Amino acid sequence: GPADKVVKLPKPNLNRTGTVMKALSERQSTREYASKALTLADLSDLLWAANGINRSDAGKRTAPSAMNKQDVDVYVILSEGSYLYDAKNHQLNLIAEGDYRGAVAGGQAFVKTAPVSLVLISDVSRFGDAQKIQNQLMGAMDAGIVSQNISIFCSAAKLATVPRASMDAAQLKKVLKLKDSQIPMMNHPVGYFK
Amino acid sequence: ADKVVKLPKPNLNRTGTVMKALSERQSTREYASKALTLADLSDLLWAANGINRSDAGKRTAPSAMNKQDVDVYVILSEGSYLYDAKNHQLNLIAEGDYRGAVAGGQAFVKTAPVSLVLISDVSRFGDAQKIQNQLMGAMDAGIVSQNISIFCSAAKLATVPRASMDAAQLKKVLKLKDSQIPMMNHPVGYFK
Numbered sequence A: 001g002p003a004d005k006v007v008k009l010p011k012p013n014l015n016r017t018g019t020v021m022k023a024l025s026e027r028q029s030t031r032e033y034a035s036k037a038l039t040l041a042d043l044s045d046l047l048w049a050a051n052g053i054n055r056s057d058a059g060k061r062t063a064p065s066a067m068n069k070q071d072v073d074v075y076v077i078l079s080e081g082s083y084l085y086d087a088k089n090h091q092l093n094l095i096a097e098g099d100y101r102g103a104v105a106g107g108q109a110f111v112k113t114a115p116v117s118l119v120l121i122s123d124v125s126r127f128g129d130a131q132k133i134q135n136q137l138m139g140a141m142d143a144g145i146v147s148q149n150i151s152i153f154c155s156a157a158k159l160a161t162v163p164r165a166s167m168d169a170a171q172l173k174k175v176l177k178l179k180d181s182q183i184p185m186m187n188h189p190v191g192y193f194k
Numbered sequence B: 001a002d003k004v005v006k007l008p009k010p011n012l013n014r015t016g017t018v019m020k021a022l023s024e025r026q027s028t029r030e031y032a033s034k035a036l037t038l039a040d041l042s043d044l045l046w047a048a049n050g051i052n053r054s055d056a057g058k059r060t061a062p063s064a065m066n067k068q069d070v071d072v073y074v075i076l077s078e079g080s081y082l083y084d085a086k087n088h089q090l091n092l093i094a095e096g097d098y099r100g101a102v103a104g105g106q107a108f109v110k111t112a113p114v115s116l117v118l119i120s121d122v123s124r125f126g127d128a129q130k131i132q133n134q135l136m137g138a139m140d141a142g143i144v145s146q147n148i149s150i151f152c153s154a155a156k157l158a159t160v161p162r163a164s165m166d167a168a169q170l171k172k173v174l175k176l177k178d179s180q181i182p183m184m185n186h187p188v189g190y191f192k
């Protein structure tokens, strides 16, 4: 049924000025962030870049996926609550109230300073048996792909981010109410540069 | 037949924007019957996994523990090459047309003027047989793949990320170590 809270995001701003070649030139991991929340425009553009619908007729995405199974769900961990990005409606649906940035950090405390973390969770059951390692590998490739959309957008938009595999995956499974077929693969703390 | 192809300096002044590149990012499996220019090949490889910070030797693509495990091999009609990121050049590995090895059964691949093969040297993480290290290598390949896909979209090049390929034949042709696992490939060409 409907989530208890919904964040409708603005249309993505396709007129931003950062070129691909400059974004690749400046692409880098940054592990310190301003405490300030992302504006809604920056969050919207970030999530659309990550894994937004870019072809509304076909339902296809900014990120390719094996067999077009679109397995990578982007969970958005904010201080107020954790949300799932719904690409079809370009909106955030609340999953759990509370600040779960600690679960993402998994022992690296700088992660708790980012205003947002994106967790890239592959629903490996979209490929069939979530137990088969070739399915898990495709999920890992697919996650990598979404990760780099985030890193490239962040470079263009002058946002700090670092791709990460470390996290408390057991705690995230509980707090985000994941099924065991949904495997956290990577996360991206994101913020303005400090 | 030359052992090394020098690539021109990467052109950091190309025009296509990130947001427009994301908008037009798509898999294309048909290609003009045109070869890539040397400038486009140069820029494509630098985009994939070039050095962007010469002081640190760091790259356009992140990698787990900065191990830089993804090597990019370049399969052209004249020969198969390794991309040497340090010197921004192609080192010839095998003469002849090995695009059939990349195709692995999908014949459209043979019609692209170049294929990039993304090979993770999983020994850079330690034990090449450990599943956690193979997963990191798969993530890292996917990261490089998306650099390719986004560059292609910005540069009006057709590409498709692929996992299918004849990995046994590529191990032979490219003289891979047992630790170097072909992960993904990208046929690239101009649009029809």
Ligand SMILES: Cc1cc2nc3c(=O)[nH]c(=O)nc-3n(C[C@H](O)[C@H](O)[C@H](O)COP(=O)(O)O)c2cc1C
Pocket (backbone or CB within 6 Å): A027, A028, A029, A030, A031, A108, A162, A163, A164, A165, A166, A167, B058, B059, B061, B062, B063, B064, B065, B066, B136, B139, B140, B143
């Ligand atoms: C798959 C993968 C996993 C990573 N995991 C972590 C991590 O858990 N924590 C962290 O601080 N950095 C992590 N990194 C970031 C790397 O350390 C970083 O990409 C590398 O040192 C190179 O620096 P650069 O991204 O600025 O080029 C990860 C990167 C990748 C690609």
Ligand SMILES: Cc1cc2nc3c(=O)[nH]c(=O)nc-3n(C[C@H](O)[C@H](O)[C@H](O)COP(=O)(O)O)c2cc1C
Pocket (backbone or CB within 6 Å): A060, A061, A063, A064, A065, A066, A067, A068, A138, A141, A142, A145, B025, B026, B027, B028, B029, B106, B160, B161, B162, B163, B164, B165
């Ligand atoms: C990890 C991965 C593996 C893929 N392997 C193949 C492949 O072997 N052959 C193929 O034709 N396409 C392959 N694809 C491309 C997908 O079919 C394609 O991304 C998907 O159909 C969605 O189309 P789109 O990329 O235009 O959004 C692969 C994509 C990914 C991400």
